[PDB]
Amino acid sequence: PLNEEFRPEMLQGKKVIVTGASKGIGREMAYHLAKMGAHVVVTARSKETLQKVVSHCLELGAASAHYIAGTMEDMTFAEQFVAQAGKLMGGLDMLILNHITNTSLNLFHDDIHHVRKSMEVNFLSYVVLTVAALPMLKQSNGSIVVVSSLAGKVAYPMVAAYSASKFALDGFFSSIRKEYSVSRVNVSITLCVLGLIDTETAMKAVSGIHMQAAPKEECALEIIKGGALRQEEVYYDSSLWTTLLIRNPSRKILEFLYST
Amino acid sequence: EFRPEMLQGKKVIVTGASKGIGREMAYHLAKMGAHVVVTARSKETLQKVVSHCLELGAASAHYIAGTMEDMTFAEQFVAQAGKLMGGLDMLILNHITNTSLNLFHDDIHHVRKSMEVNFLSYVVLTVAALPMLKQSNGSIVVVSSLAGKVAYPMVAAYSASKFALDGFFSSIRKEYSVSRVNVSITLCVLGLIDTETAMKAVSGIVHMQAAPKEECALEIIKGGALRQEEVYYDSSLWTTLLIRNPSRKILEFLYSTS
Ligand SMILES: NC(=O)c1ccc[n+]([C@@H]2O[C@H](COP(=O)([O-])OP(=O)(O)OC[C@H]3O[C@@H](n4cnc5c(N)ncnc54)[C@H](OP(=O)(O)O)[C@@H]3O)[C@@H](O)[C@H]2O)c1
Ligand SMILES: NC(=O)c1ccc[n+]([C@@H]2O[C@H](COP(=O)([O-])OP(=O)(O)OC[C@H]3O[C@@H](n4cnc5c(N)ncnc54)[C@H](OP(=O)(O)O)[C@@H]3O)[C@@H](O)[C@H]2O)c1
Numbered sequence: 023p024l025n026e027e028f029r030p031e032m033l034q035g036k037k038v039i040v041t042g043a044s045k046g047i048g049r050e051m052a053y054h055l056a057k058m059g060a061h062v063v064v065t066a067r068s069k070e071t072l073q074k075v076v077s078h079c080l081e082l083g084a085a086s087a088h089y090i091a092g093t094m095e096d097m098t099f100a101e102q103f104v105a106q107a108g109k110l111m112g113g114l115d116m117l118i119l120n121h122i123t124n125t126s127l128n129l130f131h132d133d134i135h136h137v138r139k140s141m142e143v144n145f146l147s148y149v150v151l152t153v154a155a156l157p158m159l160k161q162s163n164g165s166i167v168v169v170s171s172l173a174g175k176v177a178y179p180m181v182a183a184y185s186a187s188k189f190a191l192d193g194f195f196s197s198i199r200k201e202y203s204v205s206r207v208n209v210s211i212t213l214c215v216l217g218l219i220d221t222e223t224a225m226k227a228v229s230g231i232h233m234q235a236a237p238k239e240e241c242a243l244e245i246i247k248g249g250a251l252r253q254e255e256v257y258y259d260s261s262l263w264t265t266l267l268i269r270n271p272s273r274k275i276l277e278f279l280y281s282t
Numbered sequence: 283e284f285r286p287e288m289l290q291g292k293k294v295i296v297t298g299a300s301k302g303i304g305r306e307m308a309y310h311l312a313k314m315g316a317h318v319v320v321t322a323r324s325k326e327t328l329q330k331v332v333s334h335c336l337e338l339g340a341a342s343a344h345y346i347a348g349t350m351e352d353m354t355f356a357e358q359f360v361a362q363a364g365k366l367m368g369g370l371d372m373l374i375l376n377h378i379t380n381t382s383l384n385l386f387h388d389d390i391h392h393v394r395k396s397m398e399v400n401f402l403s404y405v406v407l408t409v410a411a412l413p414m415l416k417q418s419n420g421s422i423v424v425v426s427s428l429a430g431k432v433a434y435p436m437v438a439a440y441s442a443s444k445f446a447l448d449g450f451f452s453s454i455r456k457e458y459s460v461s462r463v464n465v466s467i468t469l470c471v472l473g474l475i476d477t478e479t480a481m482k483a484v485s486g487i488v489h490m491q492a493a494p495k496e497e498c499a500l501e502i503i504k505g506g507a508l509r510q511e512e513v514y515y516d517s518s519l520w521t522t523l524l525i526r527n528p529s530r531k532i533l534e535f536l537y538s539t540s
């Protein structure tokens with residue numbers, strides 16, 4: 023945990039992966055990383071929009087910028103990609119897991135395909151990616167950034183499948199963090215709990231069925247700062263006070279009462 | 283408010299009932315004269331459980347054997363079990379894939395397996411049982427853990443799956459409130475319980491004070507019977523108090539208005 027105020031320069035020449043960076047917040051994090059002269063590798067399924075993104079990262083000031091098109095549904099591609107992007111940058115310092123499968127707001131009936139798909143993409147691919155990135159992150163004492171949500175901390179309706187995977191992220195990576203402490207692994211693990219963010223995808227699914235969205239740009243920055251400064255958790259949401267209710271002191275105690 | 287006569291003639295499914303807490307719940311339900319259908323992989327042991335349940339005063343007691351790794355078996359087990367009992371009033375989800383206490387070592391197969399068995403099958407069982415439960419205005423009782431509420435080392439995959447249950451079943455619980463579906467969801471957060479599988483997994487390394495599996499089962503059963511939302515059961519009273527999370531409830535309401 024860096025006891026320090028953030029400075030863009032922290033990312034100058036840092037080698038960073040960003041998943042789900044063909045649109046929404048993943049696109050935003052790429053630009054910010056570009057301006058800070060970082061080496062970026064972005065990924066997603068659409069090779070078209072990815073190029074558009076790479077094109078722009080270069081001209082913003084990236085030290086380098088590549089895209090690799092694939093689907094995170096394919097566990098063999100997740101592993102490969104991370105090695106491909108390892109080659110492209112000569113190492114890895116930060117791993118930003120951002121991508122999610124196409125979700126929408128709907129009551130849950132019998133959609134067991136979507137529940138499994140959600141786990142596989144939103145959660146299980148993160149673990150694979152992580153296993154593949156770890157050898158290189160350990161070398162650079164780097165960081166894992168996992169993007170999550172309010173729905174991954176508290177229960178809302180119409181996002182059950184989605185919320186289940188985000189909860190799963192919390193439990194797994196939090197437990198891994200604890201393991202890196204005991205195991206003395208020096209790789210930071212940052213979990214970001216985002217409220218409604220005004221991405222193209224989000225605003226479509228929400229409209230009509232009535233809240234307030236936060237800017238995707240500041241949002242992308244906040245994620246990157248929490249990562250750079252190696253914080254445990256990062257909160258972001260339109261309301262400030264909202265962010266205050268998310269931390270759980272009781273969870274903090276129960277976690278200690280059984281360490282020793 | 284609880285009284286064993288609440289289960290009298292209640293059609294109940296208990297999963298992972300061949301051993302540990304599953305076994306103990308069947309026995310409790312069998313003293314209350316519930317109709318009971320149990321399951322697990324081992325028929326040899328499931329038979330021993332089924333006979334004992336009848337000696338105890340079970341309205342009826344049968345087993346159907348299979349691995350919950352098989353979503354097909356899981357979907358059929360619930361039809362077959364409901365058809366046999368002429369209905370379902372309570373669904374006790376309690377089985378988990380064999381787990382040991384270990385640091386993560388890139389064993390993704392184990393993570394996938396844990397999600398599949400400990401979590402996705404719970405949803406398949408639920409989808410299959412829902413119609414009968416909407417019909418009996420009954421209950422779903424999901425059995426979870428402290429490691430499904432807070433982070434510990436040595437139980438990553440086990441932890442992700444238990445967290446998954448909370449996020450899914452808590453979200454659908456809120457969905458059933460606005461759909462007026464009348465079926466309760468009870469998430470049970472249990473600390474260390476003295477089942478044989480638990481005590482061989484921990485006692486090696488550092489250990490704790492293990493609550494009694496028999497009482498634990500009854501608490502699970504009562505909780506569901508009273509249609510509570512959560513149920514905490516641990517040796518310490520200092521645990522129960524901390525497990526509750528008041529901020530969450532406030533956020534849940536705050537953005538529920540929508
Ligand atoms: N925006 C919000 O309101 C909000 C709120 C809470 C949490 N979050 C979290 O913030 C992150 C981004 O939200 P977002 O609105 O920016 O998502 P988004 O706008 O829908 O874009 C998601 C990204 O995932 C990629 N993707 C989709 N399917 C994929 C697959 N099978 N394999 C690989 N990549 C895939 C998409 O590119 P392609 O489809 O072209 O492959 C896209 O780049 C997510 O983790 C979400 O959980 C967002
Ligand atoms: N005991 C604890 O320390 C503790 C603490 C917190 C939470 N819990 C929760 O309490 C519940 C029971 O724990 P427990 O101590 O009673 O475990 P247990 O005693 O070892 O019983 C596990 C049950 O699951 C069955 N099972 C295993 N694999 C299966 C599969 N692939 N498909 C279907 N069934 C399978 C086992 O029978 P077969 O092998 O013959 O199939 C057995 O009946 C679990 O949800 C656990 O997470 C326990």
Ligand SMILES: C[C@@H]1CN(c2ccc(F)cc2C(F)(F)F)CCN1S(=O)(=O)c1cccc(-n2cncn2)c1
Pocket residue numbers: 124125126127171172173174178179180181184216217218219223224227228537538540
């Ligand atoms: C609603 C947003 C955007 N979602 C999202 C993100 C990217 C997508 F591509 C699609 C979505 C989704 F369709 F789920 F909205 C995922 C869920 N989140 S959230 O967890 O930040 C959140 C905040 C506040 C309230 C809620 N509520 C849910 N029900 C009621 N309130 C959810």
Ligand SMILES: C[C@@H]1CN(c2ccc(F)cc2C(F)(F)F)CCN1S(=O)(=O)c1cccc(-n2cncn2)c1
Pocket residue numbers: 280281380381382383427428429430434435436437440472473474475479480483484
């Ligand atoms: C360790 C026990 C028994 N486990 C269990 C249940 C059934 C099994 F079949 C196997 C296990 C397990 F191997 F995880 F022990 C599941 C996990 N739990 S727990 O969530 O009740 C718990 C309470 C307090 C501390 C911990 N810690 C774990 N590491 C550090 N603290 C876990």
